[PDB]
Amino acid sequence: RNLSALKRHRQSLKRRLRNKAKKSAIKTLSKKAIQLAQEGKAEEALKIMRKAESLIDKAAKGSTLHKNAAARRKSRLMRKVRQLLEAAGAPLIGGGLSA
Amino acid sequence: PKKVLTGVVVSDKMQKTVTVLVERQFPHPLYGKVIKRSKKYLAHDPEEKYKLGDVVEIIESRPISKRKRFRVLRLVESGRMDLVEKYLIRRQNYESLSKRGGKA
Amino acid sequence: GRYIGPVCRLCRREGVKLYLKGERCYSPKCAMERRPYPPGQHGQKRARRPSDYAVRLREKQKLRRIYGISERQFRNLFEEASKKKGVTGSVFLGLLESRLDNVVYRLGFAVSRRQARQLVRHGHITVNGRRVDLPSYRVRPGDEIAVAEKSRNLELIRQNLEAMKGRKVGPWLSLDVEGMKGKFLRLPDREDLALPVNEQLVIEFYSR
Amino acid sequence: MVKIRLARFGSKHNPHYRIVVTDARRKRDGKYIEKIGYYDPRKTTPDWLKVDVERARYWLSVGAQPTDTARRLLRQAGVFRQEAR
RNA sequence: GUUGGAGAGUUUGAUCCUGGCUCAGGGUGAACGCUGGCGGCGUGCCUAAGACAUGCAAGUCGUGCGGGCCGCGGGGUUUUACUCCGUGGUCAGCGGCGGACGGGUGAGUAACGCGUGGGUGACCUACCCGGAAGAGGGGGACAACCCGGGGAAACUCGGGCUAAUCCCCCAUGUGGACCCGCCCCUUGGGGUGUGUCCAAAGGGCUUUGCCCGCUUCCGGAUGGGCCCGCGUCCCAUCAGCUAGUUGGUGGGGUAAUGGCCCACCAAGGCGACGACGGGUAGCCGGUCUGAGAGGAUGGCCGGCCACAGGGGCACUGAGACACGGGCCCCACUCCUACGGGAGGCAGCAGUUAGGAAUCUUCCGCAAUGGGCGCAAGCCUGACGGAGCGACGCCGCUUGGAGGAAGAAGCCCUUCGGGGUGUAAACUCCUGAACCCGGGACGAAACCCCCGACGAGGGGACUGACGGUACCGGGGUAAUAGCGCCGGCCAACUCCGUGCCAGCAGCCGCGGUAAUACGGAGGGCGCGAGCGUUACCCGGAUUCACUGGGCGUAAAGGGCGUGUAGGCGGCCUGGGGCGUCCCAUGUG
Ligand SMILES: [Mg+2]
Ligand SMILES: [Mg+2]
Ligand SMILES: [Mg+2]
Ligand SMILES: [Mg+2]
Ligand SMILES: [Mg+2]
Ligand SMILES: [Mg+2]
Ligand SMILES: [Mg+2]
Ligand SMILES: [Mg+2]
Ligand SMILES: [Mg+2]
Ligand SMILES: [Mg+2]
Ligand SMILES: [Mg+2]
Ligand SMILES: [Mg+2]
Ligand SMILES: [Mg+2]
Ligand SMILES: [Mg+2]
Ligand SMILES: [Mg+2]
Ligand SMILES: [Mg+2]
Ligand SMILES: [Mg+2]
Ligand SMILES: [Mg+2]
Ligand SMILES: [Mg+2]
Ligand SMILES: [Mg+2]
Ligand SMILES: [Mg+2]
Ligand SMILES: [Mg+2]
Ligand SMILES: [Mg+2]
Ligand SMILES: [Mg+2]
Ligand SMILES: [Mg+2]
Ligand SMILES: [Mg+2]
Ligand SMILES: [Mg+2]
Ligand SMILES: [Mg+2]
Ligand SMILES: [Mg+2]
Ligand SMILES: [Mg+2]
Ligand SMILES: [Mg+2]
Ligand SMILES: [Mg+2]
Ligand SMILES: [Mg+2]
Ligand SMILES: [Mg+2]
Ligand SMILES: [Mg+2]
Ligand SMILES: [Mg+2]
Ligand SMILES: [Mg+2]
Ligand SMILES: [Mg+2]
Ligand SMILES: [Zn+2]
């Protein structure tokens, strides 16, 4: 056995288990943004959107998503919420949204 | 210079897609008479404009589907069935030369 | 190595004197002088026609022996004149004379070519002022073939450095008798070298 | 990174070194991106070292790192010199 | 400098043409036999991608940080216990950067895999370079250590303490990201307007400033993914293939386009200019052959690919879907207490296997290259060299000058005589080997002081080859071996043998006069090599572009029709696809 090696797999484990916690937070959180987006609670969805959008960026400073890949998940959400609120009621906050 | 190709459409029968037949001439590697060999390029025509038998240019482009790597540049002439018949004559003839058979 | 054996018998093989026995080879001794006909059990009997290829080969062998270098590099010397820009017969010789073991034998310092070699092999020779044990040696125009002082007072050097007051060099050459020196003017011509070879016939063996 | 170093082109006991610009991780004697001179360490000639300064002076505005050996061979080429007052 | 092109043998009583088989020429990663003195430079599992024991082959930083241990030196006490600071030997850990580069072998693939040339407005990029700005405030974990349980072992389980450049929340945000808006450009490119979200970490010393770092941003360079244009072996005794198949809209996924992947809709896509299947092989720079045109080939060195016992898979990360990292199954080997676990050389070297054949368990990290480090340094089976192998090319010795009308012996003789043959014997000369001594280049850097940390200058360290190469002196005459000798093919006779024994590449020799078999003498060719066997090209205008042919010699379809395709008369003009020309980028 070669203790230079083993080191980096114990390493792995620990980041996987911080990278799991990171993503599997964002799914959850942003799914509960899509959700509040449906039935027009423009107040609350636009709250959840920004506490999504940041937990994005801080997984972008890191090594979970790339700037390229995190920017992606920002447009997935941001646009798709600006649009579920089409089929309902106008943006109260206008938090993570530019009129 | 994302390559530019002049060929004549020979397939309408698809969605926003179209098949084009581009041909080229050249001395035979060794034997060296001019020969002329051609190939068909599944082009992209979005708004659908160009029809079955048109004379077009194509350019290398951002891949659109599996076998779509060319958008259509412009039209050099319309109505040129002469070859579309010829290309179909070739496509037909495969009915013959089979070891199923060919009837009278 | 080199061929080493009964030399005056090729004085007679190809039927003319090859002055390789050396100072004896101007006698009424050198083998040829007595019995012209070439070697063994039959040498005296009637000789029939030589093949086109016979003759092709004879006149090659002569020039290979006569210059006292073995086949394998008699070749790379031919095939190095081919590869060189000018008359092939005439370049060839041109780099037989530039070899060290027949840079001596024409600069005087020896009796025959086989001898003349020994003096090269054995640390006896100066080339632009240095010691050269290398018969394979490309002597260029302007080179300085002399003798290292240490061997100078040797008889074999000197009885031979003697006789040179009765001969001359070869017009691509200055002999400095006393100073024990020698100078390579130019290459030769086929003008000079009057060998008993016909050289195109040599090349017609290195066409096949 | 981008680097400048030495690459072997002689044989046994007869090294002749080449000055090169090549990517760090590249094999020693491999497809370099630019030959900028030779260096003869057995020094058997009047010209046992050529460089050409003007390229290594593009190539460091570039940001290609020398070796030690190769560094020392450039100072000695003039590569790193300054003038005026 | 048009620099370059040899053919013969054999069908017949003979001759002319066709036509095959055959030989001469060069070529190797070679083997085999007889023989084998040397050195330099190459080069050496082509067979089982069969299986591998032992050692090494990737780690480094104490200047990211907290301790174990085993001491050593100094402190608080009058003396003990115990505790405080540093420090040395050391050992894992926490963290950073690397493990993807280097090396190996071509099993696999006929394929954007490789070569050539372009797109990327569809992309990332660590350490390095330049440019713009910034490090304020608060919180917590996991090891190490301690205490405890499972286990034959492998190792695994449990609760507690803690630091840091490790983890997280808040703020400032020069700038950047995303949503929507306009304005240039035009496939996702550049600007700007509101809302929204994100920064960081401290160690060292020449301590009031220099150094290695830190964070967000444009760019340089570097490397790289992905896409297209042409090039890319055979057999049609494989002709029809295709259902994620071809395309559409929505979606997921990636650094990125896209049936890549999913849902839903239309029914396409491909093919005789070889789709499909089967066979074979990594591709190229180049290498061999050849007058050229082509034919043959891709060990070594180098450029790209693909695997790491067979197969699938994801994590970490800028990067792989990772040889000496990870999860699962199978074959194989092995430990076992019959629960279970370990193991992967096609990295160097060796063993075993196989086979006609392929080597040392060498020295050293001095050079050069790479990783890490402020640095001294540390790891370096890359690599630098040595060993072994005539395996290959080249350099070299075995002597040379003199010597009989010509020893002996050996062979022929027409018995006069002819030949080995100036060869040997001795005469003289030189001095491989060996002996003595001296004895390298390859190596000046990093580092250290001056000087500014810069330019420049000065000092110091260091040789695995090696006591080699090479220089001075000394010195002995001092390995020859293979093929052939009827023709092609350089070389001729005696015996022995008698279609026997035997040679042979082709025709062929041998049935008592054998230039052919086995010996001798003599001869030709080569020489530390000469031969034989296998393969590549030439010969072979015997695949015929150069450069062929069908009346009888192998060959005109048994005759028409006509489709694809190939080809085309005279007069002028427009295009410039070909083809020519010049400049240029690439090779
Ligand atoms: Mg990741
Ligand atoms: Mg000596
Ligand atoms: Mg006959
Ligand atoms: Mg030839
Ligand atoms: Mg041969
Ligand atoms: Mg032997
Ligand atoms: Mg092998
Ligand atoms: Mg300590
Ligand atoms: Mg590799
Ligand atoms: Mg196939
Ligand atoms: Mg625990
Ligand atoms: Mg903030
Ligand atoms: Mg951090
Ligand atoms: Mg802190
Ligand atoms: Mg294969
Ligand atoms: Mg030819
Ligand atoms: Mg090939
Ligand atoms: Mg290689
Ligand atoms: Mg194996
Ligand atoms: Mg696998
Ligand atoms: Mg291994
Ligand atoms: Mg180094
Ligand atoms: Mg040897
Ligand atoms: Mg042998
Ligand atoms: Mg030799
Ligand atoms: Mg003699
Ligand atoms: Mg020196
Ligand atoms: Mg003859
Ligand atoms: Mg025989
Ligand atoms: Mg007889
Ligand atoms: Mg015989
Ligand atoms: Mg041919
Ligand atoms: Mg013919
Ligand atoms: Mg006939
Ligand atoms: Mg007929
Ligand atoms: Mg015409
Ligand atoms: Mg006209
Ligand atoms: Mg044109
Ligand atoms: Zn003579």
Side-chain angles (χ1 to χ4, degrees):
Chain A
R1 98 192 212 181
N2 308 302
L3 296 150
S4 171
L6 321 165
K7 280 188 74 201
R8 262 278 200 193
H9 196 60
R10 302 191 230 105
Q11 234 94 58
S12 224
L13 289 159
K14 309 254 307 185
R15 301 172 207 269
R16 171 187 178 108
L17 278 288
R18 166 183 17 256
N19 279 343
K20 276 180 183 169
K22 273 179 154 223
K23 281 202 179 198
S24 298
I26 269 67
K27 321 177 182 191
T28 283
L29 250 233
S30 259
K31 292 176 185 176
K32 285 268 174 62
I34 308 175
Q35 206 40 57
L36 269 192
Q38 225 253 6
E39 328 80 11
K41 340 289 194 52
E43 165 112 337
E44 311 288 332
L46 304 194
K47 166 182 164 182
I48 306 190
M49 220 224 320
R50 304 145 81 176
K51 219 206 290 183
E53 172 214 41
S54 171
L55 293 248
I56 304 323
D57 287 327
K58 271 203 255 56
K61 70 188 187 185
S63 108
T64 346
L65 313 177
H66 210 48
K67 245 273 231 75
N68 302 48
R72 246 182 44 214
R73 305 215 199 169
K74 285 170 77 174
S75 198
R76 307 253 151 134
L77 182 55
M78 261 190 177
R79 217 177 37 193
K80 217 177 303 168
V81 168
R82 142 169 297 262
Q83 296 166 4
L84 288 231
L85 304 182
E86 302 297 341
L92 308 201
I93 313 193
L97 271 195
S98 276
Chain B
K2 344 189 184 53
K3 194 52 163 291
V4 193
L5 292 176
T6 4
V8 145
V9 187
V10 285
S11 195
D12 191 340
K13 269 201 314 164
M14 256 180 305
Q15 317 260 182
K16 291 157 185 181
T17 335
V18 14
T19 317
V20 192
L21 184 65
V22 204
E23 182 190 67
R24 70 201 126 92
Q25 273 151 2
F26 46 62
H28 183 255
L30 164 60
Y31 290 146
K33 96 138 110 211
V34 162
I35 54 172
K36 132 222 313 174
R37 244 51 103 183
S38 345
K39 193 173 61 183
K40 49 201 288 182
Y41 293 104
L42 299 193
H44 177 73
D45 201 31
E47 110 261 19
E48 263 244 314
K49 188 189 256 96
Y50 316 83
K51 71 160 186 196
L52 174 31
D54 286 19
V55 186
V56 307
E57 273 158 11
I58 14 172
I59 56 98
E60 185 188 337
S61 273
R62 180 232 289 184
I64 310 282
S65 72
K66 187 154 189 171
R67 309 162 91 243
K68 284 177 78 173
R69 330 283 189 167
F70 289 88
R71 288 140 101 268
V72 184
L73 205 60
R74 50 166 283 258
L75 183 70
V76 195
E77 209 194 346
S78 191
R80 209 54 197 282
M81 312 319 295
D82 25 299
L83 318 101
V84 206
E85 299 184 34
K86 239 164 195 164
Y87 165 55
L88 279 201
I89 295 160
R90 162 149 80 87
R91 282 293 160 255
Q92 232 153 239
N93 289 262
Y94 290 144
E95 175 195 353
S96 43
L97 24 89
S98 297
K99 278 203 168 180
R100 161 195 264 151
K103 213 252 193 306
Chain C
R2 54 139 169 171
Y3 173 59
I4 258 158
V7 209
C8 229
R9 120 197 243 202
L10 336 166
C11 229
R12 61 209 260 270
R13 177 84 257 185
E14 11 265 275
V16 101
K17 268 253 173 131
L18 312 190
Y19 295 166
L20 261 203
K21 247 320 188 204
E23 198 167 5
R24 168 160 189 175
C25 231
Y26 315 78
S27 26
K29 305 166 163 197
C30 170
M32 224 304 303
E33 262 294 357
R34 315 280 190 91
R35 26 148 51 155
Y37 63 94
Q41 192 169 339
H42 338 267
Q44 284 184 282
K45 312 170 184 172
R46 37 166 286 94
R48 318 91 159 281
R49 189 194 174 262
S51 67
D52 262 76
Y53 164 73
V55 189
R56 226 101 245 119
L57 147 74
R58 294 295 34 146
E59 222 110 348
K60 159 249 164 184
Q61 268 291 44
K62 157 173 325 190
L63 183 59
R64 174 202 167 217
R65 271 151 166 185
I66 235 308
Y67 258 77
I69 292 94
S70 55
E71 171 62 57
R72 222 285 177 250
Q73 40 183 217
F74 180 91
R75 237 201 149 135
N76 319 117
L77 256 298
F78 189 115
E79 320 248 31
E80 201 198 336
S82 310
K83 295 218 162 184
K84 266 185 177 278
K85 285 226 303 160
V87 190
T88 280
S90 308
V91 168
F92 193 25
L93 294 189
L95 359 114
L96 291 205
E97 295 321 284
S98 298
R99 216 171 152 74
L100 211 49
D101 54 318
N102 196 107
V103 128
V104 154
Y105 174 98
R106 300 212 187 295
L107 229 199
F109 319 2
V111 165
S112 68
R113 261 164 219 108
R114 312 176 54 97
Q115 187 202 103
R117 175 138 154 196
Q118 192 127 33
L119 310 153
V120 187
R121 230 342 229 192
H122 276 141
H124 295 355
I125 332 287
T126 270
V127 177
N128 264 14
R130 203 211 333 100
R131 202 174 66 263
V132 192
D133 53 315
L134 284 171
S136 58
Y137 196 97
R138 193 146 295 271
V139 175
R140 343 209 45 119
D143 251 339
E144 233 135 38
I145 301 300
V147 222
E149 329 93 346
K150 314 300 288 178
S151 345
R152 269 216 190 95
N153 12 275
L154 234 147
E155 36 171 271
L156 232 61
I157 299 200
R158 300 211 321 222
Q159 23 165 332
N160 291 154
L161 218 212
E162 261 315 322
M164 290 301 138
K165 304 169 195 179
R167 297 196 254 281
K168 185 119 202 181
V169 258
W172 67 105
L173 279 183
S174 80
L175 171 55
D176 193 28
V177 254
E178 170 239 61
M180 296 233 192
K181 249 167 56 169
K183 279 245 53 197
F184 209 57
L185 263 180
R186 357 139 303 202
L187 282 81
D189 301 322
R190 188 39 157 86
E191 164 103 342
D192 298 339
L193 293 279
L195 314 196
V197 283
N198 169 241
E199 76 264 35
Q200 192 233 350
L201 240 298
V202 180
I203 321 182
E204 289 186 19
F205 177 101
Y206 293 105
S207 84
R208 171 167 183 162
Chain D
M1 73 229 125
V2 196
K3 284 178 76 171
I4 336 164
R5 36 172 182 90
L6 296 198
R8 184 92 142 222
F9 285 104
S11 37
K12 225 146 289 185
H13 307 310
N14 197 108
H16 281 291
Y17 275 66
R18 194 159 247 151
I19 307 167
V20 290
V21 193
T22 206
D23 187 274
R25 299 154 301 186
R26 167 158 292 290
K27 313 161 100 195
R28 200 210 283 166
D29 314 322
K31 179 182 156 271
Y32 49 118
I33 345 121
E34 197 169 34
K35 190 207 164 176
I36 32 149
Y38 64 133
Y39 153 55
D40 193 351
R42 253 193 43 177
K43 310 193 201 82
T44 62
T45 18
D47 275 331
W48 56 279
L49 172 62
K50 165 212 161 188
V51 159
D52 168 280
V53 181
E54 265 228 331
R55 288 309 291 182
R57 289 202 172 178
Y58 152 79
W59 278 106
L60 271 139
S61 47
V62 163
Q65 229 63 355
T67 343
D68 285 333
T69 314
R71 168 181 292 284
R72 99 166 159 93
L73 244 121
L74 287 186
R75 274 194 222 257
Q76 173 170 348
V79 173
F80 282 64
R81 143 156 303 152
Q82 310 158 329
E83 272 191 25
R85 231 192 310 222

